[PDB]
Amino acid sequence: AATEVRNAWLALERTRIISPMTGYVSRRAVQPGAQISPTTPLMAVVPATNMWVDANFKETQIANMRIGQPVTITTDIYGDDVKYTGKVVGLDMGTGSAFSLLPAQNATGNWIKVVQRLPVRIELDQKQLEQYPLRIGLSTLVSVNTTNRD
Amino acid sequence: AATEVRNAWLALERTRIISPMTGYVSRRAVQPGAQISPTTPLMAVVPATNMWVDANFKETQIANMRIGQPVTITTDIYGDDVKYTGKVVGLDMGTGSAFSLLPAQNATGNWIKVVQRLPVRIELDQKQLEQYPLRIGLSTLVSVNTTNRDGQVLANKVRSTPVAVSTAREISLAPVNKLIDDIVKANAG
Amino acid sequence: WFLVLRHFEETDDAYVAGNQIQIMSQVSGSVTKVWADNTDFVKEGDVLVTLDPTDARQAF
Amino acid sequence: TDDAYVAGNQIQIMSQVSGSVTKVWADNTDFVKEGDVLVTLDPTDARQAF
Amino acid sequence: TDDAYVAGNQIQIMSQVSGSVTKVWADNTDFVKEGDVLVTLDPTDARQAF
């Protein structure tokens, strides 16, 4: 019976929904009086601490890319007056079209060749992020120094 | 046994559906004789008191915008004969495409650069709405004064007061407690 | 004159926004009354729909 | 390449129970600390079970 | 033919239970082995049942 008491108490303590992460509220689809189940989205919390860049290079540029190479990133909100430094994290194991939420169907006859793209992860330095914050979805022009291939 | 009695009584009382807010009705998708469950939407109530504006600025303009800066908003229904005053509440940490459920562009086609937009929350003065009310989705021309720049881009103050609270769906358990007492006295000999 | 226009930022992509609640029932059943229609002012604590109480009374 | 965006972590907030909302504590573009309440539910049925 | 593409195997990692995640041990572009834990859940309710 003590176990059942504990289960009921945890059920009651969970009527207050707690935030698991420090961040900022983005979308709010919850109103007083709404009927909620554990499958209904309520909010979103977007921290601003650890942010990286996702560059989509063509198939014809990732030939000489290695992990740890120097990188330089210039956003558009700020321009050429502010520059960010980073380094390669790792090349993804699939093309965007292949791993899209909707597959691409190449065996259809009405097929036109198109150069593919591969996501690449770039690690930004956090010290300069505090001075110049960045939001999710902004656009930047990247540049990888491939002079060293080891 | 009393706990089950109270649960059953609450189930019966909820056979009436009550309004949790004071507003106006829209999209009444409910007719007599329908079969309903808690996941079936019945209608909507749209409070007409606290409205804001969502201004979509390009990435080029987002810079130099801080919290609290003055704003001026003009609408189309009322033309230029009426102005509005407001303030920046804050900028969003996302561009809309962050949470999209579909690819931004087709996989088959090529990639074309598109300048992004970032929403901004602007809060209106409430003494002007009551005399010149608005409606959801109306177009408006926004202009933000960016002369003064303290450097407050992200809010960092938490508040102890809730924003939106409703307690119209809380049921007091007095009559159930009286009925239980009467039944106990009846069956006690 | 021109940099004054630079001291401001404009956008015509704005739209008024507000709150909306989808009224939903806490229980299942059948409908026997509907207390409001489109463009009706309803106050907090007002009844909007009513269900047949035949099935709940038996459990009670 | 100019096809590079800025990516980060975003978390959806989902309840572990089912209930009816009675309060909301963050509206939009508001700062939130870890451990703070964002939504509260009516505790009648859970209290009865307890 | 010019309409040729490389294909391989993929795994949709899923849980055998339900719960709430308290730890994640891998991000994108990370190397994983056959026994390495990837996600962790809260063991309270299961402990009660045990």
DSSP assignment of B89-140 equals EEE-S--STTS-SS-SS-SSS-------EEEEEEEE-HHHHTTS---TT-EE
Q: Which of C28, C30, C41, C44 to mutate to test the interface with B (most CBs of B within 10 A)?
A: C44
CA gap B90, B92 in Å, rounded = 7
* Residue A108 φ/ψ, nearest 5 degrees: -140, 5
* Secondary structure class of A36 (helix, strand, coil): strand
Q: How does DSSP classify residue B170?
A: -
CA gap B169, B17 in Å, rounded = 9
Q: In A1-25, which positions are buried (b, 16+ CB within 10 angstroms) versus exposed (e)? A: eeeeeeeeeebbeebbbebeeebbb
| D49:A9 CB<8 A | no
Touch between E and C (at least 3 CB pairs under 8 Å): no
Contact A69, B175 (CB under 8 A): no
Q: Which of B5, B16, B51 to mutate to test the interface with C (most CBs of C within 10 A)?
A: B16
| B93:D20 CB<8 A | no
List the strands of the sheet with C47-51, edge to edge: B16-18, C47-51, C29-34, B35-36
Residue C21 at interface with chain A, using a CB cutoff of 8 Å: yes
* Secondary structure class of B64 (helix, strand, coil): coil
The angstrom resolution of this structure is 3.6
Alpha-carbon distances of B140 from A131, B76, B86, B128, rounded to whole Å? 33, 6, 13, 15
Return the residue matching tokens 């499958």: A39
CA gap E16, E6 in Å, rounded = 31
CA gap E45, A3 in Å, rounded = 10
DSSP assignment string, A87-129: EEEEE-SS-TTTTSSS-----SS-------EEEEEEEEPSHHH
CA gap E13, D44 in Å, rounded = 38
Contact A8, D46 (CB under 8 A): yes
Return the residue matching tokens 């300069």: A128
Contact B26, B50 (CB under 8 A): no
Q: How does DSSP classify residue B67?
A: T
| B15:C50 CB<8 A | yes
CA gap B147, B140 in Å, rounded = 22
Q: Which distant-in-sequence residues (6+ apart) come within 8 Å of A44 by Cβ?
A: A25, A26, A27, B94, B99, D10, D11, D12, D13
State the structure-solving technique.
cryo-EM
- Which tokens sit at B125? 């003065």
Angle between helices B174-187 and B2-13 (to 10 degrees): 140
SS3 string of C1-60?
CCHHHHCEEEEEEEEEECCCEEECCCCCEEEEEECCCCCCEECCCCEEEEECCHHHHHHC
Q: Which of D11, D30, D41 to mutate to test the interface with B (most CBs of B within 10 A)?
A: D30
Contact D23, A36 (CB under 8 A): no
Return the residue matching tokens 């573009």: D29
Neighboring chain A residues of B62 at a CB cutoff of 8 Å:
77, 135
Give the amino acid at D22: T
Sign of CA dihedral C27, C29, C31, C33: negative
| CA proximity to B73, closest of B51, B93, B90, B91 | B51
CA gap C21, A30 in Å, rounded = 8
Return the residue matching tokens 């979509």: B56
| CA proximity to B155, closest of A71, D31, D24, D26 | D31
CA gap B181, C4 in Å, rounded = 77
Residue D4 at interface with chain A, using a CB cutoff of 8 Å: yes
- State which residue of chain C sits closest to B119, comparing Cα positions: C14
